[PDB]
Design a protein around this motif. Structure first.
Motif, PDB file in Angstrom:
ATOM      1  N   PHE B  17       0.824  -1.204   0.000  1.00 18.90           N
ATOM      2  CA  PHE B  17       0.000   0.000   0.000  1.00 18.90           C
ATOM      3  C   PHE B  17       0.860   1.256   0.000  1.00 18.90           C
ATOM      4  CE2 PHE B  17      -2.533   3.297   2.087  1.00 18.90           C
ATOM      5  CZ  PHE B  17      -3.665   3.273   1.302  1.00 18.90           C
ATOM      6  N   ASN B  18       1.959   1.240   0.757  1.00 22.54           N
ATOM      7  CA  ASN B  18       2.888   2.365   0.733  1.00 22.54           C
ATOM      8  C   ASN B  18       3.517   2.543  -0.644  1.00 22.54           C
ATOM      9  OD1 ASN B  18       3.720   1.493   4.070  1.00 22.54           O
ATOM     10  ND2 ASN B  18       2.633   3.346   3.427  1.00 22.54           N
ATOM     11  N   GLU B  19       3.857   1.438  -1.311  1.00 26.39           N
ATOM     12  CA  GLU B  19       4.391   1.507  -2.666  1.00 26.39           C
ATOM     13  C   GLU B  19       3.358   2.050  -3.645  1.00 26.39           C
ATOM     14  OE1 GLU B  19       5.861  -2.202  -4.058  1.00 26.39           O
ATOM     15  OE2 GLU B  19       6.646  -1.389  -5.940  1.00 26.39           O
ATOM     16  N   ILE B  20       2.092   1.666  -3.479  1.00 30.58           N
ATOM     17  CA  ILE B  20       1.025   2.184  -4.335  1.00 30.58           C
ATOM     18  C   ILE B  20       0.864   3.688  -4.137  1.00 30.58           C
ATOM     19  CG2 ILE B  20      -1.470   2.163  -4.657  1.00 30.58           C
ATOM     20  CD1 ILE B  20      -1.220  -0.928  -3.977  1.00 30.58           C
ATOM     21  N   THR B  21       0.880   4.134  -2.877  1.00 30.91           N
ATOM     22  CA  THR B  21       0.745   5.559  -2.587  1.00 30.91           C
ATOM     23  C   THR B  21       1.930   6.349  -3.129  1.00 30.91           C
ATOM     24  OG1 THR B  21      -0.402   4.888  -0.567  1.00 30.91           O
ATOM     25  CG2 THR B  21       0.178   7.203  -0.786  1.00 30.91           C
ATOM     26  N   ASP B  22       3.137   5.785  -3.035  1.00 35.96           N
ATOM     27  CA  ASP B  22       4.309   6.435  -3.611  1.00 35.96           C
ATOM     28  C   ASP B  22       4.241   6.464  -5.134  1.00 35.96           C
ATOM     29  OD1 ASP B  22       6.734   7.706  -3.823  1.00 35.96           O
ATOM     30  OD2 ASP B  22       7.942   6.012  -3.137  1.00 35.96           O
ATOM     31  N   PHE B  23       3.713   5.404  -5.750  1.00 34.75           N
ATOM     32  CA  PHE B  23       3.623   5.343  -7.204  1.00 34.75           C
ATOM     33  C   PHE B  23       2.617   6.350  -7.745  1.00 34.75           C
ATOM     34  CE2 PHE B  23       0.638   3.529 -10.341  1.00 34.75           C
ATOM     35  CZ  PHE B  23       1.392   3.697 -11.481  1.00 34.75           C
ATOM     36  N   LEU B  24       1.494   6.535  -7.051  1.00 34.03           N
ATOM     37  CA  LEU B  24       0.470   7.447  -7.550  1.00 34.03           C
ATOM     38  C   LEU B  24       0.898   8.909  -7.493  1.00 34.03           C
ATOM     39  CD1 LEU B  24      -2.534   5.655  -5.886  1.00 34.03           C
ATOM     40  CD2 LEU B  24      -2.370   6.065  -8.341  1.00 34.03           C
ATOM     41  N   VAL B  25       1.881   9.253  -6.662  1.00 30.55           N
ATOM     42  CA  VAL B  25       2.328  10.636  -6.549  1.00 30.55           C
ATOM     43  C   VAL B  25       3.736  10.852  -7.091  1.00 30.55           C
ATOM     44  CG1 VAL B  25       0.867  10.912  -4.527  1.00 30.55           C
ATOM     45  CG2 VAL B  25       3.284  10.395  -4.237  1.00 30.55           C
ATOM     46  N   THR B  26       4.457   9.786  -7.431  1.00 23.33           N
ATOM     47  CA  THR B  26       5.843   9.886  -7.854  1.00 23.33           C
ATOM     48  C   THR B  26       6.020   9.655  -9.348  1.00 23.33           C
ATOM     49  OG1 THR B  26       6.589   9.186  -5.656  1.00 23.33           O
ATOM     50  CG2 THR B  26       8.165   8.942  -7.445  1.00 23.33           C
ATOM     51  N   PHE B  27       5.205   8.793  -9.955  1.00 22.52           N
ATOM     52  CA  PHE B  27       5.391   8.383 -11.343  1.00 22.52           C
ATOM     53  C   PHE B  27       5.128   9.556 -12.280  1.00 22.52           C
ATOM     54  CE2 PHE B  27       3.585   6.684 -15.312  1.00 22.52           C
ATOM     55  CZ  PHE B  27       4.694   6.007 -15.772  1.00 22.52           C
ATOM     56  N   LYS B  28       6.135   9.906 -13.076  1.00 24.97           N
ATOM     57  CA  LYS B  28       6.020  10.898 -14.137  1.00 24.97           C
ATOM     58  C   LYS B  28       6.387  10.207 -15.443  1.00 24.97           C
ATOM     59  CE  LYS B  28       7.876  13.738 -10.681  1.00 24.97           C
ATOM     60  NZ  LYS B  28       8.226  12.372 -10.204  1.00 24.97           N
ATOM     61  N   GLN B  29       5.449  10.173 -16.382  1.00 22.02           N
ATOM     62  CA  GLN B  29       5.691   9.493 -17.646  1.00 22.02           C
ATOM     63  C   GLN B  29       6.584  10.333 -18.550  1.00 22.02           C
ATOM     64  OE1 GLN B  29       2.309   7.739 -19.847  1.00 22.02           O
ATOM     65  NE2 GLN B  29       3.976   6.411 -20.552  1.00 22.02           N
ATOM     66  N   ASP B  30       7.625   9.704 -19.087  1.00 16.46           N
ATOM     67  CA  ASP B  30       8.524  10.364 -20.026  1.00 16.46           C
ATOM     68  C   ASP B  30       8.971   9.394 -21.115  1.00 16.46           C
ATOM     69  OD1 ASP B  30       9.795  12.539 -21.064  1.00 16.46           O
ATOM     70  OD2 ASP B  30      11.452  12.564 -19.625  1.00 16.46           O
TER      71      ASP B  30
END
Ligand SMILES: Nc1ncnc2c1ncn2[C@@H]1O[C@H](COP(=O)(O)OP(=O)(O)OP(O)(O)=S)[C@@H](O)[C@H]1O
Ligand SMILES: Nc1ncnc2c1ncn2[C@@H]1O[C@H](COP(=O)(O)OP(=O)(O)OP(O)(O)=S)[C@@H](O)[C@H]1O
Ligand SMILES: Nc1ncnc2c1ncn2[C@@H]1O[C@H](COP(=O)(O)OP(=O)(O)O)[C@@H](O)[C@H]1O
Ligand SMILES: [Mg+2]
Ligand SMILES: [Mg+2]
Ligand SMILES: [Mg+2]
Ligand SMILES: [Zn+2]
Ligand SMILES: [Zn+2]
Lengths: 84, 699, 637, 97, 364, 66
Positions: B17-30
């Protein structure tokens, strides 16, 4: 159990022939073949059914005739028939 | 207790769940993070569905590996437990939801204002409870510690609307593509499409992709998930979840105020306050190449919920990605052995093998490919030669099949009557001219293509039949092949072998584009806008020049006139052409491909998107081309009058021939991606009409 | 722990120690699974954990234990399975599911039929042969359910059992689905961690070949588990080896109070799909190394085409080119599937028309007997629904479902049509699609499907005047549509012309055939008929082990090997020959029995490919093209 | 062999020819029977027996019945110039019995 | 007779003749069954020897545990096992088979306006699978009573079968016998040494038919048949002979067919269009109870290994024509329907009779 | 069944019964055998009790070992 229908010669013109259920006891079984005219005397009584009839919405009873006697309205030859 | 023993599993939902929360706010598509912008769009009531792409998650994990930190394999955990991770992702999204920039107004949906009122009621309950407990002032006494403790006591004392009752979005898992798995040495069972035979019991609970043809789609119905009841006694709203095919309603109120009191209130359902889902049940069938030798194709149930409804239609070759989930057993009680469960695939993503023409959009990606195909030069001839590269010759036949695929412009006149824009093409000829192969090729190219046999499809298999739908529990009219090929090309092989009922159905369809059925089942008129391509033989099976062309064509004058183009395909033995045909066929048999290397054939998907772009244009005709068409029609009528008595007659010239010329000219103008019709389009249409019959019969 | 259970475990351990074949079969299964697991780790299929056990070897070892398995399998099979599991775990120490058992060999009085099964065979290991009629859906059965408690964050589980998994009955303890744990916290079901085992039930009735011709047949229910599901389809001939068990109480409870009796069904341990004549099961046979070496030795000979063709039906004189055509059809050619989804035919269709009593139906019956998946059909007996497919209604699901006709069931096989001329017009239109497009398109009420029908077709026709007339044109004699003649690759006109020397040769051949005795048979003893059932795995009489002419069982080995192994490719030396022959035949002036279309070139290609398959050659050579052209020229002229 | 829709039981009816065993069968309008009744009549006068193979029942029933039939000529009027063979729809084997 | 069964015959042994409509599948009854208590672990055995009741369990599992009433143990370890605590241990139980028959009165003697009456019968052990449906039997049995849930106190009668006697035995492959007594073998060998065997066997063929001696020789050759073949290449050559007799009417062709049907061990006499309700060749229909394909009937499959006498061979259906062709040469019938595909043996000698057109045979 | 499972014990009651019979027949303490004369006295109604001495059995076993 024998279904008794009104004979078509006695039915009123526009009306359908009525029918009844006749219950035959121990000695009255197999005495009336289908398609023949008989005259049955018996007690006209009320059959009992569980929870009456739900389709009608009324406390409607079915009626039967418990036969006390049956009279009909044979290829047996005797010795007199033989000599004739 | 030992009655319910425990096991140690490698999965830990807290760090995931912590990884999901980090992914939803950290992932920037490039603008900033991708899913934060998506959630901002959702909160502004501009988006209704959140699609989580596993490619993004895999890229995020691999980048975290390149920085060197340790991140768990979230992709495989989603692939094995998609049902749990749906709710995990929904909770993570609800934790960090951006505030709506747009203010709510009277034009928003009823669900949006209901959820907004629920949220405001939640904040008002929290504020009232905090105010009441602060006004009690129990200890009369560290402000941060007392604020934290007051927050926890208010949070666990109050009864709030749960997040499930305040969600306006549906969450779906897009499967990771095979290419991105190939880039990073990942082996994914979600990417590989399976047939319905290969989906066994060990695939339950997993996110898997099934490949197949859709056979039956239910009507969209409201399936309730939680029912809202109101109580007049206490004012509470009692919500009862539902996760079964049937439920029993609540009668007495179960709120705390009524539970403590002696007098229980009575609950009444509120349909507007309860939560429904758009529900469809679909049947997916095993494809012909996936069925083993001598077996019957099997079927699988697909449950379509939320915003994915109406994305599946019968006869569609499709990849459906979803969670394989069990269902309660339906069948005879005497035949069950243990805890038998039925199976269904809760659909999450839908991929079309043949994209529909109506779904075409002029995006940035299609624009460069269309422009490249335009600037390659001679788009008409190149598209014609690439319909069936295996079939040598038949250039005009392939040209008119391409015009059949494109079609003309339908006309609607203000008095209400309509003129059809779909072209109808007949291919009649001697056996061994590969007209069946051309029909199969046209069926493969068109997104909605139905291939039928003259005696294989009966009257009931062409028009309609009434049948009971058990999921919706109602009698519905299931259509035939002409219904199944609506807004698409319907190909009828062996047209001369049809019975009179099917001939009557086609006779009405080719002109009226409707079927009027007045039987003991239903008195209805149904829309069948098929563009009809027929294949046929003469009387004796072979063409003979001794008889007139009308004599050896078993076709009535009216249904002859309905065909815009009829192609005689005569097998005339000539030494020079047989060399080329033999070398072409034998090269196709040897190198398994087209022999001509001077041009690259256009791929069927590329052809499909170009035809989709061409169908958007609506060309018009000016005065000069109108006069040219009028004079051409007059000359055609005079020539038909002159040749009516002679043996060279091919019929009588008809106003339907005028409409066919107009339709072919409009299709040719569409193929040029132009809004105008020129002279040369009309010359090409007239040339196609002339070389349809006269050029080959004269030789 | 039970003493007799341990004694039987030790006895089966000794039996497995004596016969090393089962031990290294277990080892082969384990190393195959480990190799697939390592390949999945580095860069697939998994074998089931069961072993075929020969009952004859067990009878040789321990007669008491063999009779214990046959008579009382509930006390003897679980110890044997336990011993096998212990041995497999002993060999798995260096590199979890318990191992099962499968039984083969002679059963004696336990080899029964669904009619012969009575209740004296209950609780016994029986082998039952029959035909599959109903095959239910494969449904997952929940064995272990795994749940998650979020308040404590702990994974719990529950195991479920029923009466159909274990042979010996135990106390039925119904454990409900756990939705809360002991302390009352909410449990969420973890799909994907729960264990589901596939379950099927089939209905096997007696085969119509040995069913009585008058009265109704008898059927039984067979329960199949994870490694035995989807081994059968309806219409298969099967031999099911399993325990004839009885379940539940036959109404003797107070709640139950009816006379269904004790429900009886077979806990299937082994399913064998047997090949019978004109059925949907393809005849497959084990190829030993000696047979492959012999096939390779015959592949190098130059007269091999003249050996295999003349050794097909040595009891029929003449018709040598018909034998060659039948052999090339049995080779099957090569089909082509292009990148755009197009399909090109590989199969060869043969039509023979001519005078009666010319060995046409005998050739048809030979191809029925000698092909792997040949299905026999007559003219007026079969109809449009019986040939392609039909639609019925399933009782359980309530929806429509498909019945595969004669032509669909002979996929990748031969359809032997006798009396082709008397077929109806709707049949002709239906088969126009199947002979060329190789598929069956169904467009009925609610059902629109496409079924694969890749077949070779042999047809036998009769001229409308009864006898073929030489001076008449062949179009009036055949009296068939031109499209149908174009579908058939080869058309052979057979004429019963009378010649004294030829008739002497025919009479001598027939009498020499009529002076035949089977080996081991007396002069006056009549030859007995045994119905030919073969397991599907995966004028000289003395033709034995390739002396002059190939015997029929070795000819089937040759045909099977040439079908699965070699896939030849065309080369320009054959291409020039076939192009020259085709373009010549299109421009010949002589009248031909068969009309010439663009299909004739593909018939040339298919015949060349089939002749290359005869030679076991990776490529198509010039002599193959010459043979293909010269065989077609006889059929045309 | 017929199944009663309500009683849900099977009944084997011998028909008029079996039912008239050691009696007489009176067939009105003998000319316009269908094919099935014609085959039944031919079997009844040929072997004096009727064979049934239906619904798992394979047996024969005695049909020793005398047959008195009534028929009309072809066209509704008898032709004296034309013999009886072409004046009826009955074929020779059923007429000679 | 079945119509004369009164209430005075109830629970009495009665003998009644009739015909059989249907024989049900074999149900499994329990003779010896071992039971174990659910929690008490008490083992008991029940041996049942009365299997003749229908619609009612005259013997059932006990409603409560029997360990308490027995007081078997001196230790005697309130404990209640519960209602119906016994489970049947199936691996140590013994079962037999039971069959239901349905017997109708003879359809020859039925009133014209009446549906014929039938009775349900129960048989067990060695009385099951002794009859096929359609045969005429005499049943000895107990006329008895069962209550099935039309009269306040009414009962359905049935027959407890105690013995079955068959009036006639039908001829088929499975009903054929191949065992022979030694005296019959001595008589058959002594007959064969007669040098005038051909003349006696031709004279014994239809002694009431005058003339047609060559046809009688043909009948003898038809009855003997030839030697069947199984050749090494797999193709078989038949030994059965086919004889056609066409000619003018009134010439004892049908009488010869009837005599061949009467004298053959297995034979079916049929017409060209079949029988009244018995078809020709092979008929595959669905099962009336399970809706599954099975071979219903047909003259050439009921008379496999025998003779079919086909009168009126000229009037015939086309599907019958092609099936008869395949049955005459190949001696097999190939049926490929929508569900079932099979080739079944039809090894039958065909004796056919036909009439020429235009009445008499024409010499011109 | 598994409700009453079985165990293997070193005691065998067949060969032990045979040894008991052989001890009662062939034991001679040092008129004829001791327990055969005891049984004759019991059969003549002169004795009502049979006393089995384990010392006699141990003597019998050690002679059999000798
Ligand atoms: N010009 C051509 N180029 C390539 N292949 C061809 C050509 N003409 C015929 N063929 C082949 O010839 C065969 C004929 O098959 P079909 O497509 O069924 O022909 P057809 O015109 O449909 O015949 P029917 O069904 O009697 S109208 C196929 O294998 C085609 O690929
Ligand atoms: N040569 C004969 N010897 C004895 N009885 C004969 C002879 N010829 C005819 N009959 C009798 O004449 C009657 C005519 O019946 P059949 O001749 O058997 O019928 P059939 O004419 O042979 O068959 P058809 O052509 O279908 S009517 C029968 O009763 C025969 O027994
Ligand atoms: N060339 C031949 N060689 C051997 N036997 C033959 C030949 N031609 C016909 N026969 C025999 O004639 C019989 C008639 O059957 P068949 O010829 O198959 O009929 P049809 O030719 O009508 O199919 C067969 O039993 C077969 O043995
Ligand atoms: Mg075609
Ligand atoms: Mg033949
Ligand atoms: Mg006759
Ligand atoms: Zn309330
Ligand atoms: Zn107890």
């Amino acid at each position: 159990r024998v279904t008794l229908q009104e004979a078509p010669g006695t039915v009123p013109p526009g009306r359908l022939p009525r029918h009844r259920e006749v219950i035959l006891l121990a000695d009255l079984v197999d005495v009336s073949k289908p398609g023949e005219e008989v005259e049955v005397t018996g007690i006209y009584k009320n059959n009992y059914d569980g929870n009456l009839n739900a389709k009608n919405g009324f406390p409607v009873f079915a009626t039967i005739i418990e036969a006390n006697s049956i009279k009909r309205r044979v290829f047996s030859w005797t010795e007199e028939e033989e000599r004739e | 207790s030992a009655a319910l023993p425990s096991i140690q599993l490698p999965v830990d939902y807290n760090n995931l769940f912590n990884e999901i929360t980090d992914f939803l706010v950290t992932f920037k598509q490039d603008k900033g993070p991708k899913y934060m912008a998506m959630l901002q769009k959702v909160a502004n009531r501009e988006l209704n569905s959140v699609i989580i792409d596993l490619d993004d998650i895999l890229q995020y994990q691999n980048e975290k590996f390149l920085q060197g930190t340790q991140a768990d394999d979230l992709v495989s955990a989603i692939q094995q437990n998609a049902n749990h991770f749906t709710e995990l992702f929904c909770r993570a999204i609800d934790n960090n939801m951006p505030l709506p920039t747009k203010e709510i107004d009277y034009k928003d949906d009823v669900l949006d204002v209901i959820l907004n009122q629920r949220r405001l009621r939640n904040e008002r309950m929290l504020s009232d409870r905090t105010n009441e407990i602060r006004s009690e002032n129990l200890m009369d006494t560290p402000p941060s510690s007392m604020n934290d403790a007051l927050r926890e006591v208010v949070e666990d004392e109050t009864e709030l609307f749960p997040p499930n009752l305040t969600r306006r979005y549906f969450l779906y898992f897009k499967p990771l593509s095979q290419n991105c798995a190939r880039r990073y040495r990942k082996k994914a069972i979600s990417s590989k499409p399976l047939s319905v035979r290969q989906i066994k019991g060990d695939f339950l609970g997993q996110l898997i992709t099934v490949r197949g043809i859709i056979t039956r789609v239910s009507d969209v119905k409201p399936a309730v998930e939680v029912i809202a009841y109101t109580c007049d006694q206490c004012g509470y709203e009692v919500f009862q979840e539902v996760n079964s095919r049937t439920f029993t309603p609540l009668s007495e109120c179960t709120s705390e105020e009524c539970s403590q009191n002696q007098t229980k209130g009575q609950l009444f359902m509120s349909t507007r306050a309860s939560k429904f889902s758009a529900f469809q049940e679909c049947k997916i069938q095993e494809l012909s190449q996936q069925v083993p030798v001598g077996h019957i194709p099997r079927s699988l149930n697909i449950h379509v919920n939320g915003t994915l409804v109406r994305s599946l239609s019968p006869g569609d070759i499709v990849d459906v990605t979803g969670i394989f989930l069990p269902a309660p057993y339906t069948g005879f009680k005497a035949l069950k052995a243990g805890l038998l469960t039925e199976t269904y695939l809760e659909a999450q993503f839908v991929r079309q093998h043949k994209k529909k023409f109506a779904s075409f959009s002029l995006t940035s990606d299609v624009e460069e490919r269309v422009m490249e195909l335009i600037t390659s030069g001679d788009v008409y001839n190149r598209l014609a030669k690439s319909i069936a590269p295996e079939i040598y010759g038949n250039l005009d036949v392939k040209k008119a099949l391409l015009l059949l695929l494109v079609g003309g412009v339908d006309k609607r006149v203000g008095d209400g009557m309509k003129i059809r824009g779909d072209i109808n093409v007949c291919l009649m000829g001697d056996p061994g001219v590969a007209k069946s192969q051309l029909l199969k090729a046209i069926c493969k190219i068109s997104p909605r293509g139905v291939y039928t046999t003259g005696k294989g499809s009966s009257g009931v298999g062409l028009t309609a039949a009434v049948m009971k739908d058990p999921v919706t529990d109602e009698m519905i009219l299931e259509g035939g092949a002409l219904v199944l090929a609506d807004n698409g090309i319907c190909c009828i092989d062996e047209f001369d072998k049809m019975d009179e009922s099917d001939r009557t159905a086609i006779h009405e369809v080719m002109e009226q584009q409707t079927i009027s059925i007045s039987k003991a089942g239903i008195n209805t008129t149904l829309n069948a806008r098929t563009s009809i391509l027929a294949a046929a033989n003469p009387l004796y099976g072979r063409y003979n020049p001794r008889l007139s062309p009308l004599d050896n064509i078993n076709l009535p004058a009216a249904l002859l006139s309905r065909f815009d183009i009829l192609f005689l395909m005569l097998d005339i033995p000539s030494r020079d052409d047989d060399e080329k045909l033999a070398e072409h066929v034998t090269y196709v048999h040897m190198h398994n491909k087209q022999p001509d290397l001077d041009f690259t054939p256009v791929e069927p998907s590329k052809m499909r998107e170009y035809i989709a772009y061409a169908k958007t244009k609506r060309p018009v005709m000016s005065e000069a081309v109108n006069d040219y068409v009028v004079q051409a029609y007059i000359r055609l009528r005079q020539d038909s009058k002159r040749e009516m008595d002679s043996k060279f007659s091919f019929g009588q010239a008809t106003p339907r021939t005028l409409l066919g010329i107009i339709r072919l000219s409009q299709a040719l103008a569409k193929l040029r991606l132009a809004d105008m019709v020129d002279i040369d389009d009309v010359e090409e249409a007239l040339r196609l009409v002339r070389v349809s019959k006269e050029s080959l019969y004269q030789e | 722990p039970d003493a007799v259970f341990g004694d039987r475990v030790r006895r089966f351990q000794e039996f497995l120690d004596t016969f090393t074949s089962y031990r290294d079969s277990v080892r082969s299964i384990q190393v195959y699974n480990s190799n697939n697991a390592a390949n999945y780790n580095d860069d697939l299929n998994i074998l089931p954990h069961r072993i075929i056990i020969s009952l004859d070897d067990l009878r040789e070892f321990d007669r008491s234990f063999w009779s214990g398995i046959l008579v009382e399998p509930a006390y003897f099979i679980p110890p044997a399975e336990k011993a096998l599991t212990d041995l497999a775990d002993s060999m798995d120490d260096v590199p979890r599911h318990p191992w099962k058992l499968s039984f083969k060999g002679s059963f004696g009085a336990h080899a029964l039929s669904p009619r012969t099964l009575t209740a004296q065979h209950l609780n016994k290991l029986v082998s039952v042969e029959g035909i599959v009629t109903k095959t239910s859906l494969v449904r997952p059965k929940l064995i272990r359910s795994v749940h998650y408690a979020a308040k404590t964050g702990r994974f719990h589980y529950r195991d479920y059992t029923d009466a159909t998994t274990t042979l010996t009955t135990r106390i039925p303890t119904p454990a409900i689905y756990p939705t809360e744990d002991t302390e009352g916290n909410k449990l969420t079901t973890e799909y994907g961690y729960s264990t589901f085992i596939d379950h099927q039930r089939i209905t096997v009735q007696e085969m119509p070949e040995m069913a009585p011709a008058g009265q109704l047949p008898r059927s039984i229910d067979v329960i199949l588990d994870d490694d035995l599901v989807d081994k059968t389809k309806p219409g298969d001939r099967v031999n099911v080896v399993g325990v004839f068990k009885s379940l539940g109480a036959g109404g003797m409870n107070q709640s139950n109070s009816t006379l269904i009796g004790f429900k009886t069904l077979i806990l299937g341990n082994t399913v064998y799909p047997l090949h019978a004549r004109s059925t949907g099961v393809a005849a497959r046979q084990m190829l030993t190394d000696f047979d492959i070496r012999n096939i390779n030795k015959l592949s190098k000979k130059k007269d091999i085409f003249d050996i295999l063709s003349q050794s097909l039906a040595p009891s029929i004189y003449g018709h040598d080119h018909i034998k060659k055509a039948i052999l090339l059809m049995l080779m099957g050619g090569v089909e082509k599937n292009l990148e755009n989804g197009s399909h090109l035919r590989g199969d060869i269709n043969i039509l023979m028309v001519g005078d009666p009593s010319t060995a046409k139906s005998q050739l048809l019956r030979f191809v029925l007997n000698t092909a792997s998946l040949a299905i026999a059909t007559t003219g007026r007996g079969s109809s449009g629904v019986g040939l392609t497919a039909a639609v019925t209604t399933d009782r359980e699901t309530g929806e429509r479902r498909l019945e595969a006709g004669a032509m669909v069931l002979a996929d990748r096989g031969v359809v032997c049509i006798d009396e082709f001329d008397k077929m109806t017009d709707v049949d002709r239109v239906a088969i126009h699609e199947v002979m060329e497009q190789q598929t069956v398109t169904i467009a009925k009420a609610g059902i629109h499907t496409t079924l694969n029908a890749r077949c070779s077709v042999i047809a036998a026709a009769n001229p409308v005047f009864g006898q073929y007339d030489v001076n008449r044109d062949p179009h009036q004699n055949i009296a068939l549509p031109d499209s149908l003649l174009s579908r058939f690759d080869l058309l052979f006109v057979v004429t019963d012309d009378i010649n004294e020397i030829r008739d002497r040769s025919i009479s001598e051949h027939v009498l020499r055939t009529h002076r035949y005795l089977p080996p081991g048979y007396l002069e006056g003893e009549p030859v007995r008929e045994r119905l030919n059932l073969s397991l599907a795995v995966g004028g000289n009489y003395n033709g034995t082990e390739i002396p002059k002419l190939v015997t029929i069982p070795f000819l089937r080995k040759y045909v099977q090997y040439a079908k699965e192994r070699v896939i030849p490719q065309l080369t320009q030396e054959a291409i020039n020959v076939i192009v020259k022959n085709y373009t010549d035949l299109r421009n010949d002036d002589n009248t031909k029995k068969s009309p010439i279309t663009a299909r004739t070139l593909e018939t040339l290609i298919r015949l060349a490919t089939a002749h290359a398959k005869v030679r076991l050659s990776k490529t198509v050579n010039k002599v193959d093209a010459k043979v293909a052209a010269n065989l077609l020229r006889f059929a045309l002229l | 062999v017929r199944k009663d829709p309500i009683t849900k039981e099977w009944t084997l009816e011998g028909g008029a020819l079996v039912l008239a065993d050691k009696g007489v069968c009176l067939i009105d309008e003998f000319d316009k029977m269908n094919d099935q009744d014609r085959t039944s009549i031919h079997e009844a006068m040929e072997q004096q027996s009727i064979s049934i193979s239906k619904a798992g029942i394979v047996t024969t029933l005695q049909a020793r019945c005398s047959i008195i039939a009534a028929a009309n000529p072809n066209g509704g009027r008898y032709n004296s110039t034309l013999p009886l063979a072409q004046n009826v729809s009955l074929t020779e084997p059923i007429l000679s019995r | 007779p079945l119509r004369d069964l009164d209430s005075e015959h109830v629970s009495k042994i009665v003998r009644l003749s009739g015909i059989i409509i249907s024989t049900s599948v074999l149900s499994s009854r329990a003779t010896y069954l071992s039971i174990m208590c659910r929690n008490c672990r008490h083992t008991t055995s029940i041996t049942i020897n009365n299997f003749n009741s229908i619609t009612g369990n005259t013997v059932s599992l006990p409603r409560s545990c029997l360990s308490t009433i027995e007081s078997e143990s001196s230790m005697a370890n309130k404990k209640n096992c519960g209602p119906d605590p016994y489970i049947i241990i199936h691996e140590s139980s013994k079962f037999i088979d039971q069959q239901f028959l349905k017997l109708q009165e003879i359809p020859e003697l039925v009133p014209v306006g009446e549906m014929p009456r039938n009775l349900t019968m129960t048989c067990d052990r060695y009385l099951t699978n002794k009859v096929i449906p359609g045969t005429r039997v005499t049943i000895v049995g107990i006329y008895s009573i069962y209550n099935s849930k039309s009269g306040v106190a009414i009962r359905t009668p049935y027959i407890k079968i105690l013995g079955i006697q068959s009036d006639v035995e039908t001829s088929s492959i499975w009903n054929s016998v191949t065992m022979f007594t030694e005296e019959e073998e001595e008589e058959f060998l002594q007959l064969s040494r007669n040098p005038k065997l051909y003349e006696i066997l031709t004279n014994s063929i239809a002694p009431s038919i005058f003339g047609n001696e060559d046809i009688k020789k043909a009948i003898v050759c038809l009855l003997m048949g030839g030697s069947k073949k199984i050749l090494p290449d797999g193709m078989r050559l038949r030994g059965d002979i086919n004889v056609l007799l066409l000619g003018d009417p009134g010439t004892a062709k049908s009488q010869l067919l009837k005599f061949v049907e009467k004298v053959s061990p297995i034979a079916v006499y049929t017409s060209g269009k079949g029988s009244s309700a018995a078809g020709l060749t092979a008929s595959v229909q669905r099962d009336p109870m399970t809706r599954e394909f099975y071979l219903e009937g047909g003259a050439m499959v009921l008379a496999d290994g025998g003779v079919v006498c086909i009168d009126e061979f000229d009037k015939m259906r086309d599907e019958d024509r092609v099936a008869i062709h395949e049955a005459m040469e190949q001696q097999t019938i190939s049926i490929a329907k929508a569900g079932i595909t099979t080739v079944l043996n039809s090894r039958t000698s065909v004796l056919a009779a036909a009439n020429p057109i235009y009445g008499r045979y024409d010499d011109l």
